[PDB]
Amino acid sequence: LTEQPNWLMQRAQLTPERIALIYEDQTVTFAELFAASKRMAEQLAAHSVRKGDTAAILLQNRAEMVYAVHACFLLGVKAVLLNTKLSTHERLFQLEDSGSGFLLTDSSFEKKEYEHIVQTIDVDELMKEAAEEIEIEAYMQMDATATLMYTSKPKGVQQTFGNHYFSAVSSALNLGITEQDRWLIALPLFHISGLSALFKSVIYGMTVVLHQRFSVSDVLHSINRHEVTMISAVQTMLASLLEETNRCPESIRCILLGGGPAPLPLLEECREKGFPVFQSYGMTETCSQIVTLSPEFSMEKLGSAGKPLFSCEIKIERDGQVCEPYEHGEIMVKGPNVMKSYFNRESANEASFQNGWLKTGDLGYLDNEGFLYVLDRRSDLIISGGENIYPAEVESVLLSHPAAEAGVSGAEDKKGKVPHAYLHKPVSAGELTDYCKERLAKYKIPAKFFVLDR
Amino acid sequence: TEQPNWLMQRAQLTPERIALIYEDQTVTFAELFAASKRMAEQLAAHSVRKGDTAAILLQNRAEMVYAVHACFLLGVKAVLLNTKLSTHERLFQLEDSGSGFLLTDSSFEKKEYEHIVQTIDVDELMKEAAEEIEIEAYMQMDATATLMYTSKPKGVQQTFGNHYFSAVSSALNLGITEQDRWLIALPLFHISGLSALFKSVIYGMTVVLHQRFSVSDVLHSINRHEVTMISAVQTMLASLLEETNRCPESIRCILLGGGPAPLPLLEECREKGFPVFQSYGMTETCSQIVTLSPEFSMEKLGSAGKPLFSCEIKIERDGQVCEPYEHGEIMVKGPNVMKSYFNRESANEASFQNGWLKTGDLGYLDNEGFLYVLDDLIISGGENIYPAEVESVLLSHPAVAEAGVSGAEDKVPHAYLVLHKPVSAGELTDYCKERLAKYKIPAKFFVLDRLPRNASNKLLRNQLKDARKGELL
Ligand SMILES: [Ca+2]
C-alpha cells in the first residue's frame, strides 16, 4: 500500500472515451487529457524540469491549468498552486518558501516580475514547442507530496497523493457516485474545493464542467446543457442560484456548500425549491471537506457542520482533556485525508499535532448525537468576566439584522474585557441591544456600538 | 496505518439505516453494532483475548454476521470455515490456522474439535450476561482481519486494508447509491459473500441475507425488498433464468463469480434482460479484481474484463511481457491482494514475483486491454511444452508402456516411464528428437513401477518428481 498507478493514466486505460473535462466550447476525453498532460510534461522536461523539483502554477481556470497539474504528477514534480488574488509580493514569498524552481503561468499575468526567482514559462508558448518523448512516472507514491497549498506568515500545506485519494473516496462514500454524475466547478482551481474535483474526476471517471468564474446565467445554462448533477458553491453563489430559478434544476442532486453554516432563511428557501444543500466543514489541511451535513438534517441541526466522513474522526478537547457533549473546546481532526505536516515549519508542526491528531485552531462542540458545531477561531477568543465571547457568533447575530451591512467585534479593556461592535441604513443602539439580548447570553451583548464607513 | 472500526463508525454515522434483512427481520446498523459488541463481551467472558485466533463454523444467519464483527471488536483474527468440508479437512484447517477457539452452533458436532480448540455455541452465548469491555476502536490496515483457506489448502491472510480497498474499488467500478440493496444467498465463508458484509458497513448499504439459495424464495425477496445487486454463481443464475421470462426490474447488477461464463448462459441472460457482470478474482484478491460489463458478454467470449481502479494485471512468460493475444501467466497487483499465505513460506516464494501475485491461470489481453482466462497443464519453457504431447511420443515407443512428463530446473521437461523392456536414454532421446521440437525433448529419464493417478485415472504430474527413481544414465 505504498504506491498506486497514476490516476490519470489508469483512468485513460479504463474509460478512454468518457469525458474528463468540459470547458467553454471544448470537450476533453480522458484519453485526450492523458495525451495533453504527457505532451506538456515532455515540453516541461525540455525546459529542464526534473523529478523531485517544485513547480508553481499561476493560472485562471483553463483547460491548460488541468493539463499542468497532471503534467507535474507525470514528471514527479510537486505542484504549488498560487492564489491569483494575492499581491505579487505575497506570491514571491511563497515562491521562495516553497523552493519552486519554475513558474507555469501565462501572459495575462506579469511574467517579468517573477523571472528573477524562478524560470518562468508561458504555457501557451510551451504547448507549441517540440520536445522528445519521455518515460512518465507511472506510479504515484501515496506518502509523497502531490501539491503544496498555502494557508492565509502563510504555511505550505503538504498534500500527499494519499491525502487526495482518501478525500475523494470518503466523499464518494458520503455522497454516493454513479456514471451519470458530473461536477460543475466555478471556483478557483488553486483552492482545495476546486482542486479536489480534478482528482475526483480521474478517480471516479467523472466529468468536470469547468467555468472560469461564477456567472449565474452561464452556470444555469451549463447545468442544463451539460447534465450537471453536482456543484460546489459558496453562499453568494447559492443565493444567486435561488434568485434566478423557480425550482432546483432537475439534474442537480448535490450542492456542496462551503464557507460555514447557512442562515435559516437561506435553508428554508432551499427546502421549498428543492435545493439539496450539503453544508460542510474542512480546510486546506484536510484536503477539502472532512465533515458534512445532509439536506435532511439542515432544519433540525441548524448551524451544524455535520458528521465526519467515513474514515475520518473529530474530537473536542480542552487543556488536553476530552469534552462532554455540548462542552466547548478545540476541534481536532484525524484521518487519511489530513495533511502530514507543513513544509519547513518545525515549530508549527510540533504545536499543531498531538498523537496523530491535527489541531484546527477552531473552537466548537459536539451534540449528543455527534454532530459538530463550529463556533470561532481560538485566536479570536475574547474573555469577559471569565466567560467566553466568540466574536464570530456576535458578528453573525448582528449581520442577520436588516440594517447591519457589515460587523466586527473586538475586546475592549474593562475592569476584564467587554465586547465592542463596529458596524445599510440608520438603527439605534437601543434597537440593536434588544435584538442581541434575544439571541445572545448577556455577557456577549456589545457594551458599545460604533458606525463606520467600512 | 489505522481506521476507526467500520461497524462502529457506520453505526455512529447512519444508525437507523438497515444493515441486514434476514428472514424478513430487519437489523439496523446501530442494532448490528450493539449485538456484535455484546457478543464480543460474551466471548471475552469465555477467555477470548486480543491477538487470539477464532474459527467460525456457521451457516448463513444474522449470528454469523455478529460473530465476524465481534472478532474484529476484540482484535481477534477470524478463520471462516467451509461447512461442507469433511471432519478431517476441518481438523486440518483448525490446527494449521492456529485457532484457539471455534464459534459454532448445535447444528454442528463441536465435540469432535475440542481436542484442538475451545468450542463456543453462539446461541447459548448470546443469552449470557457479561461484563462490559472497551472494544478495539481501530482497525490496523496492515493487520490480518480474516484467514480463508484455498481449495494442502493454504490459509490466505486478508488484512483490513485488503478488505477496505476491495470494497472501495468495487464501488468505483459499479457505482453506489443510497437505494442499493445487495442480496447474498451464497456462503458467507466464501470471499464473495464475506466481502458483501464489509461493503455493507463501509457503504452503509443493506444486505439481504439468505440461508441458502432457493430460487422461488430469492425471487420473492428481490421483489419484496427491492434488491438492486446480487452475487451469483453459474448454477444460481441458470435457475433464475428457468423461473423467469424477464429479469426482475429492480436488479441493476448481477455479479457473477467464477471467471468467464459459457456462451449459451450469457446469451439467454442477455435475451431476458439479466445484467450480468462477469468477473475474475480469488480468495487471494479478496474478491473480484477484474469485471466485465454486460454489453461485452457475447462479443468478448472468455473475457473477465478490466482491472478495478488501483489494481493491475499483466500477462508474462519467463519474465517477458506478452503482446496482445499472446498467452502467459496471469499476474496481479493491488491493495486488495493478500499479505501472504499463513505459515507457508514455500507457497509465498512460489506465488509472488517482484511484488506481483501469480494467479496460477494462463490468459491473454486483447487490443483494448481486456483480460481473457484460458481453461493446463503446461510448462514454459520459455516456449510451450504440453507434457501430454511429449508423453504421447514416448508412449508410442515399442519399449514404453506408460509415460509422464513434468517440468524440472536444470526449466526443462523430465520424463517418467513405465517400461515393457529395457531401452537406453540415448535411444529415447533420439526417438523424441525426430518427433518433437528440440525444446520439448526430455533432459532426464526416470523408470518407475507405476505412475500416480487420481480417482478419475488422470495422471498427477505434480507428484512425479518426488517419486523419481531408476534414472537412465
Ligand atoms: Ca508403447
Curated annotation (Swiss-Prot), chain A:
Question: Which InterPro entries does the record cross-reference, listed alphabetically?
Answer: AMP-bd_C, AMP-bd_C_sf, AMP-binding_CS, AMP-dep_synth/lig_dom, ANL_N_sf, ATP-dep_AMP-bd_enzyme, MenE
Under Gene Ontology molecular function, one entry of this record is: CoA-ligase activity
User: Mind listing the GO biological process terms from this record?
Assistant: menaquinone biosynthetic process
EC category? ligase
Which reaction(s) does the protein catalyse, per the Swiss-Prot or TrEMBL entry?
2-succinylbenzoate + ATP + CoA = 2-succinylbenzoyl-CoA + AMP + diphosphate
Give the record's pathway: Quinol/quinone metabolism; 1,4-dihydroxy-2-naphthoate biosynthesis; 1,4-dihydroxy-2-naphthoate from chorismate: step 5/7; Quinol/quinone metabolism; menaquinone biosynthesis
Question: CDD domains of this UniProt entry?
Answer: OSB_CoA_lg (cd05912)
Please list the coiled coil stretches: none
Q: Which UniProt keyword terms apply here?
A: ATP-binding, Ligase, Menaquinone biosynthesis, Nucleotide-binding
Enzyme Commission (EC) number: 6.2.1.26
An example Pfam family from this entry, by short name, is AMP-binding
PANTHER family on file? LONG-CHAIN-FATTY-ACID--COA LIGASE, NONRIBOSOMAL PEPTIDE SYNTHASE PES1 (EUROFUNG)-RELATED
Tell me the protein family, please: Belongs to the ATP-dependent AMP-binding enzyme family. MenE subfamily.
Stated role: Converts 2-succinylbenzoate (OSB) to 2-succinylbenzoyl-CoA (OSB-CoA).
Q: Which NCBIfam families match?
A: menE, PRK03640.1
What protein name applies here? 2-succinylbenzoate--CoA ligase
UniProt organism field: Bacillus subtilis (strain 168)
